[PDB]
Design a protein around this ligand. Sequence first.
Ligand SMILES: C=C(OP(=O)(O)OC[C@@H](O)[C@@H](O)[C@@H](O)Cn1c2nc(=O)[nH]c(=O)c-2cc2ccc(O)cc21)C(=O)O
Ligand SMILES: [Ca+2]
Ligand SMILES: [Ca+2]
Lengths: 314, 318
Amino acid sequence: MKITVLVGGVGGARFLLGVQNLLGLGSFADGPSKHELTAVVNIGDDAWMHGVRICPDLDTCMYTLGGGIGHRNETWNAKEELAAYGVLGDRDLATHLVRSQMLRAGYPLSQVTEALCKRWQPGARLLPASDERSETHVVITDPTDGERRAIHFQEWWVRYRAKVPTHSFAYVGADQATAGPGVVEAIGDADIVLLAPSNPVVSIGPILQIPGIRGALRSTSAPVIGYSPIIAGKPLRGMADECLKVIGVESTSQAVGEFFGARAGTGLLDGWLVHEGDHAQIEGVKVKAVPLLMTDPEATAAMVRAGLDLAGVS
Amino acid sequence: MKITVLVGGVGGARFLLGVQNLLGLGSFADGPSKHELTAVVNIGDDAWMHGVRICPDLDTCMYTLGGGIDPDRGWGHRNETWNAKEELAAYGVQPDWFGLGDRDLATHLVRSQMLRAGYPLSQVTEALCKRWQPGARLLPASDERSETHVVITDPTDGERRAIHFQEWWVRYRAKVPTHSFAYVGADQATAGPGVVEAIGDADIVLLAPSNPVVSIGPILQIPGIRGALRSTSAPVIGYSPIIADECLKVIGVESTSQAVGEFFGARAGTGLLDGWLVHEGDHAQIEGVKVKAVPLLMTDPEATAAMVRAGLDLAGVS
Ligand SMILES: C=C(OP(=O)(O)OC[C@@H](O)[C@@H](O)[C@@H](O)Cn1c2nc(=O)[nH]c(=O)c-2cc2ccc(O)cc21)C(=O)O
Ligand SMILES: [Ca+2]
Ligand SMILES: [Ca+2]
């Protein structure tokens, strides 16, 4: 009755909704449930900004599973004034103010998250991958002086991506971080561990740079089942993932599967799901093609079922 | 050439509008500015709230002189929304009684980020004023902490507690048994950059008709500021706030121009005033202080411009 999922980005949050739909959790509950879902949540996008601590992946899971997905009725008047001062919705800022106060009074991020969830009641345990800072950065050639300069991922994404040469990612602080409370336990004790179809480099990937988490994944007796984020069939055949490009990995199910690789070798996957019509073959890894479009929590629920079935879990 | 005004509250800001209009400064400018205006701004109401630093008197002056103030309220931003406040309420946090508007929050966010990065309040204020262009130099009375505290009897339990001015004024509206004010940090607070110099080098110093106990009084508790006032060569002219009642009660001062004037007292003795302006039809007689009754209603920037002219004329300054 124990599922743990590694997640980041909007697609991680939508994947969790499907897990809840399958298992009758949170907004999809009728009578209080038998199963428990644990999300190990990317912190690589987290940043101190305008004096406040912003945790995007934790907030997106929390709002999404809490029914508040940014927000509804959102205004950006504070954001407007900030631009007028020459430098983030109004409701969003409330979350940031409360979190920053708890962090400055010594609550770890895992406890901060738990406190915020009393109000959102997401119906899942949302564990930060670490309580220490581990901030994804991007090394660019800065055009002002031609220097290789490390930029926070959120600034790269909005300002520099596709406009300057981009060389690599750096996980600033990962080496000094430890797995957050309960993370290693959630991975070791699960009936099954799922890699949600998030960006492999900057949503799942940074979770894997936190000392201890890759070890737990390699050694856990739980089946580890990954979901491909590559969807073929779009108009003009889609576009390559920009973050995979930075590390020179093609935007294919085959290439992302080898990125995680096989637990039987030195990698992370027992199972790899690809979208219908797609193909991959990876020694030691059971690959299966099934619908992987998160149209709605009901279609995501079928996706989660395919992962359980592939892993032989009830 | 040089005017220094001590200010606190909405009335301080409006008095500063009167000065600018008289002298062609800020939004009232038409042609080259001949004068410079410096405000020494109370910091006694400043509080940390929800992790950000609120400086109400500095913001009231900045917003008013820069055209962003709310007219109905006299504090905070115009065209304000309260979505972040409502959301704070939905999280069930305290304090739930201080109004932190969305637009106003940006000011507090920038200020707090700068203060925590090591910038002193005077430079933060200068940074924020690059956007508002108030047309006056807004000097925090101190860059250090000096906060007004209130000793009350708590109604929940009949115990004596001390609370910040903000809880007294906004949360209880002073409807609680109140026994004394305490200027915590005043004795340890150095006069802020430029403050003593602006008082020493002024052609005239004006005491705005702000709250005498909680707006002008706290500035006087900063040890260097009161000293500069006693020794500056400039005439010091005060404006009666009586034409606030709770604050005078707590300290046992009657609510009259004569009494408030004596609260500040005469420079000739141990006081601070050279002169004292009261509303027309008011008589006040204080030894060593030239008193003149003139219209003292800050109806509009040139009603006040005329109030300022009467102050210069009482001082004999041109
Ligand atoms: C009357 C005089 O003094 P003064 O006008 O400062 O009174 C206190 C108040 O204005 C100020 O200290 C502050 O409290 C005003 N003020 C609020 N006042 C309220 O009553 N309720 C509120 O929610 C509220 C929120 C708020 C937020 C930011 C801010 O910068 C000021 C704010 C005078 O000297 O002439
Ligand atoms: Ca509460
Ligand atoms: Ca000091």
